[model samples]
Target: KKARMTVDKDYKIAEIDKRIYGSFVEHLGRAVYDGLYQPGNSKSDEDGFRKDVIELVKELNVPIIRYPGGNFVSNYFWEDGVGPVEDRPRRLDLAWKSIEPNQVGINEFAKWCKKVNAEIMMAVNLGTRGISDACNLLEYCNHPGGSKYSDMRIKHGVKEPHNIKVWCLGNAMDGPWQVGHKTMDEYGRIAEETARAMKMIDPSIELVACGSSSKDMPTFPQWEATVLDYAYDYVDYISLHQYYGNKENDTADFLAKSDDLDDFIRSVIATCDYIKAKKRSKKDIYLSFDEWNVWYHSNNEDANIMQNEPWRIAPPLLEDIYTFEDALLVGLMLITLMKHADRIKIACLAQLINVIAPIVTERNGGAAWRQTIFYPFMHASKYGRGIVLQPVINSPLHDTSKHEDVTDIESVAIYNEEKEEVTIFAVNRNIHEDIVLVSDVRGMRLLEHIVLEHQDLKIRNSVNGEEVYPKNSDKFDDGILTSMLRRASWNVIRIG
Candidate 1:
């Protein structure tokens, strides 16, 4: 089958925000203890941070990272995680049923981000904590000094303020699973008050109001509507979260979920714009897709550990081993994200390291390695930096068990005017046969064709060796820049 799309230079979306390449790091699982922050290990630096882990994360070039997050921040006390490591309390974390030793807190996390050349998109506790606590954290982080919280931060050895600019009002407050889950109306009121006061403390900072946790939630657009109806004027971004799975072992149907991700983003944009009309405000509230990834591999196993093993520090939970097919879908998701670059200003790959993440570390002070999905994200974050050019497409269609009229090819183009370079990200979802992409490139020449493919869809990467990796391709046609896209592979074409 063949797919055709004309990429005109004039057709452009907004300049892509670097924050879209963001990722998440929650306190859950080995993500903290033996994952990123390990002491006495041969691979660890003097500060107890893993040098190999830091190097791998730096390679991804992530611009921002959400911290102290997920359900962990819902019941967390900020004060508990700061100050000297010994003085900091070891609390019984109700969210994960694990122990948080407070070995690494705001200062340590902020410093780690600095080492990786990134900033923190901090979240506050709206579940078990209140507005004043959030304000105090803000003052401790952004305010210079002289105030009570600011002075406490100064006394903690970090003489300079962390100056974290982005914040989330709460994490999954409407979910019944949350520590102190609130009703729609209740979350809306508190979010509004917390956002207002946080802004008063630091007007330069950006605040993200919590939307529904997922599209499958019983209250999605309604949650967005109610939350924005109250906090629209005060907040700059609305947060959205989603995770996909392939539990049924259906490749076609699983790949088709990218369209569903697009649908969720479009629906959220509609709800925001509708509320914008009702409020009659000139400003448009953007979206922060702060948590997203493929997470099904470790669910049943994770549950038993959380229940049977209680109050252990950095328990191994939500550790999903990604597959080669998962990388193809990750590429498709990145393409969809680029297509919506206009409004989706920020996004995070949920649980950045060791927990449903692109990078994995061995247990008990072992080496770190990249997952199968890491390459697409690294390529996108490195090259997908310019404005998006819309692709008007004509492609052969296929039907899966759950979806119809699914295109065999999903593709997008990004033009970097400053560098005079154009990058195309494409995914061929046809598992049975290859597809030739006939693109109208006007006058651009193909610089390089990079492809990630494997014979086994279920092939996974471990610290032992990389079973899946990208290869260079030059299968360009005579004059049209036609490239042969392999069946069920991720392609990145660089044209200069």
Candidate 2:
């Protein structure tokens, strides 16, 4: 198979947002307890945060991390997780059916973010709570100590305010499964009022309103339209959440699901534009894809755990062990996201540790390890900065079970003019044939080609072993670059 592409300096998508490479850390399962904050663990730091996890997360260069909720935030009480450790009260988390220890709270999470060199994208409780609580939390985190909430922060021992800049109105409030779920009008009004109040407290913060929980949701585009209609002026970005699975055991079809992701994004963008025109507004809204990852491997087990052992503290749940195929889909999704960088201002990889996450840690102070999906995310974050270059490509097509005319080569280019380097991120969706990729570098020299391939699509990485990683291989001459992309591989070609 053969594929040809052109990269030019003039053709560009948009300047990439560093926050697009962000991640999430919710207080669910081991993501908080054993994964990041292990109090008595030998590997933990003075604040009880796992040093290994901090180092691993730092390697990803994540700029922002969403905190303390997924579904958990809907019924969460921020007050319970603040102040002295001994003074905090333990409560039951209705969202996940887990016992909340309240050992780690707002202060600790803010401190942990500092250690990892990341900023917090805080989520307010709009489910069981409302605008008043949102304002109070905002004041406590961002206010410089005059009002009650701000002074309360000083009383809690942290003199400096967290000053968190990005805030989420709520998480998946449109889903029927969400606690205190609301209709389009109900959520729109609430999000608008809450965002209005939060801005008054701290005008510098950026707000994200909730969109539909998934593209397949019956209330998708309509939900986006209604919510934006009400909260358009108050919120800077609306949120999107999606996940992929290969339960059907079809690799081609699973890889092509990124096509679905692309369409989902376009549909949302269309809705946003329609609202802009309806309101006759000059401002444009962006996107925050805050929840996304491959989730399904632990579904049966997770259900059993929650049902059989209800309210167990941090019981292992949603622990999806990613495989080689999963990593390919992730790379494809990244490429799709970069292609729409103009609208996708923020994105989080669903999570950072243990729960369908890139980094996994052992229970009870054990070793932390990188999952197979980690490599692609790491490579993209490390080299995917600067301006996204528009790639002109001519590639062979293959039909999937559900998708037709799917390109065999899915690729995107990033040109870093400051460093004088251009990086091409490519994926070979072909399952049986290797594709020789020829590129017109347009006066740039091929620096290196890093390829991620594994013999077994089902092979997985664990605490004891890693089955997949990246290896460099390519050749270049006379302003042209050539690389043989293995069947079902993620390739990063760098040129200068």
Candidate 3:
């Protein structure tokens, strides 16, 4: 297979936000307990934060991290997790059906984020809680002393307030499986009032309203429309959550699933625009993909853990061991995200540490290793900054078992003027044929060609060893750069 692409330095999409490389750390499974915060571990720091995990997270160079919940926030009470550790109560988390010891809470996590050089994208409990509670938590985190919550924070030893910038009104309120799932009307009205009150308290902060749980939801675009209709003026962005899996064992079909992700993003963009036009509002709503990843590998095992074990503290759950194929699809998703950098501003690789995440920790005081999906994410985060060059490609298309007109190659290019470099991210969806990408890079000279490929699609990485890793290649010329992409691989062509 062969493809042609022209990279015009003048043609630009939008400046990529550093928050687009954001990650998430939820209070589920080992994500919070043993994953991000393991108290009394030998490798832990003064705060009981695992140094190995912090070092790994720092390597990703993430700018922001969403916290405290996916469904856990819906039923969470902020007060219980504050003040003294011994004073904090132990309650059952109804979402994951587990014991929630308030050992690691807001203040601790905020300090941890500081260590990793990340800000918090906090979530408030819109499920099972009301407007004022959200305000109280915000006051505790953002407001200075003299106020009740701020005084509580000062007393709690975090003399300086967190001053968090972005907040989530709720999480997946459209899903019936949620703890306090509300109808479109219900969520919209509550979110609007809460957002109105929140901004009244601190107008500088950004708010994200709940969108659909999945593209496959029965409500779909309607879910976005109805919810945005009520909360349009109050919110800054609409939250989108999606996860894909190759349950059918078809690699081609799985890699092509980014087509559906592209359509879903566009559909939500249309809904936001429609609402903007309906109200005759000048404000343009953006997107915050706060939850996204390739899940479903450990479904049966997770079910057994949650059902049989019933929520032991930090029990290993939603731990999906990623394969080489998963990394290829992840690359496709990253490219799709970059292609729409204009609207999608903030995206989180959901539950960053252990719950369906890229980095995994085998034990409490044990080895923490990078899964196969970690390389693409780290590469994009480290190098995929600056203005996105609008991608123009002419490639041969193929059909998948479930998708039609699937392009054999999915790609994007980002040009960093300050660094004098352009990075091209490409993924080859073909399983049996290699692809030759002939690109017109104008005057940019190739720096390095990094390739991640494996003959076995199901090959995985463990602390024992990394079977799937990136290897450098030299397939570039003066101006007309040519790189041979192996079948079913993720390629990063960095040039200066």
Candidate 4:
């Protein structure tokens, strides 16, 4: 039996923002020191960036990467990592409860980004530090000549300006756990002043203001309303951060919670528009989903560490070694991001390496392998180019605790006119029975089946050397049934 899908090719939802496939890297846990950089390691390059990790990151073809802190940015001093490496002072990273070696900074990061063909979406510390620090950092990276900060960069060996165009205001400033946490009024005033000053220094750059930490925050819609009230005219976009986890061990319920994210994205869009209407501003404010991922791995241990110790650098935190179930939800999240491709311009897979990441590193070993979550992200980034096609599918509904009644199947398609390729990214949320898909891409010229990646529902990958993860499905000959699409599985079907 075939469950048919009719995709209207002419019905293009919106041109997907290329940056929708972007990623974030923070100075927390091994994301920096051991994750991407190691000075004395044999695998390191001249700049101390780990060659092995860089190779994997490049394979994903990540376009833009946000950097320097999640909460670590709040109290970070840019000066500590610049100028002479020998003269730089190692400071205590109060945010992550670890020691900061002052090894990697703005300059080294820019160099590494160049090597990998990735652009920087640098973040400024608005938490503990204020406008002056933000302005100085801007000058250091952007200013060409003259100014003290620009001269500092020239003296440090790089004569040309880094010219990083996109800049974030800060990371999760609304969270109480953040260093220099502030009320809406406090953050708004400071963000407004800082944005104004930074723009004064370099107006070409785009600015993202802090919105809500997550939908579950006590001050979600209200927080966005308050912050945008102050920064409506000054900033380019508002930031949104979220992480989905299956702590309850209810895979069915958790996978369906993507419906909650759908609602969350829509509500944030409504809030942004509401503020735009209230301010009566002609300019529109988009979104930067800067931080998002699956994180439950170190929950208990992280809590213990935080209670026992405060202010250590790169503490092992949120290093959730993902399972097959987690990957399905991540794929669903990517599809959800594509659905909102128009407004949600910049979406990042939070902390790309280690720290609840898609790519994992073996402790004290040169081996680095893709986690279960890696396949969907990698596939989406590769084939999810071109215009996003709005595909409507009729399917059965399943009830979950988090979301009352959700559709059994969730899918999104992209049509690349240039490549003449149509790629379908779909997930079958039904746990017990496989939902067969019969897709109809309206008027799309049927191309050869390029590839299909999927597996059984109970699959998982482990560090203990078990390859129980998903595998690519066998090719289908039946014309009507394009792909088998297992139950509780994620599929990326590429056709040209």
Q: Any runs in candidate 2 off by more than 4 Å, and if so which?
A: none
> Where does model 1 exceed 4 Å of error?
476-479
Q: List candidate 4 segments past 4 Å from native.
A: 307-313, 445-459, 462-470, 475-481
The superposed Cα distance between candidate 4 and the true structure at residue 430, in angstroms, equals 1.4
- Candidate 1 per-residue C-alpha lDDT over 337-373 given as tens digits, one digit per residue, 9 for 90 to 100: 9999999999999878999999988888778999999
lDDT of 2 by residue, 219-323 (tens): 988989999999999999988899999989998899999989999999999999999999999999999999888887998998899789898998998889999
Error of 3 at 175 (Å): 1.6
- The TM-scores of all predictions, comma-separated, are 0.98, 0.99, 0.98, 0.94
Scanning candidate 1 in windows of ten residues, the lowest lDDT window is 472-481
Deviation in Å, model 1, residue 239 alpha carbon = 1.2
Query: After aligning candidate 1 to the native by TM-score, how far in Å is the CA of 145 from where it should be?
Result: 1.0
**Which residue pairs collide in model 2, if any?**
none
List the lowest-lDDT window of 10 residues for candidate 2: 472-481
lDDT of every predicted structure (CA atoms):
0.90, 0.91, 0.90, 0.81
lDDT tens digits by residue: candidate 3, 1-496:
7899988888999999989899998889889887878778888888889899999999988899998878999999989999988899998899888899989899999999999999999999999998999999999998988989999999999999899999999888878788899988899899999999999989999999989889888988787898889988899999889899988999989999999999989999999999999999999899999988999899989888867878588888899999999999888998988988999999999868988988888866567999999999999998899989988998789998899999888889999999999999998899789889998887555688898989899999999979988788755656787878888888999887
**Tens-digit per-residue lDDT, 1-496, candidate 4:** 3466776678888888888888988888788777787777888888888888888888888899998867888898889989899999988887777888878888988898887778999988887788898999999999998999999999999999999889988777777777888888888888888888888999999999888778888988788888888988789998888888777888889898778788988898999899999999998898899988888867998888886877665666778877778888888999999999888889889878887787777665456878888878888888889888876877778787767768877888888888777888888787677767778755553343332234553455666653434455544333333666667777777665
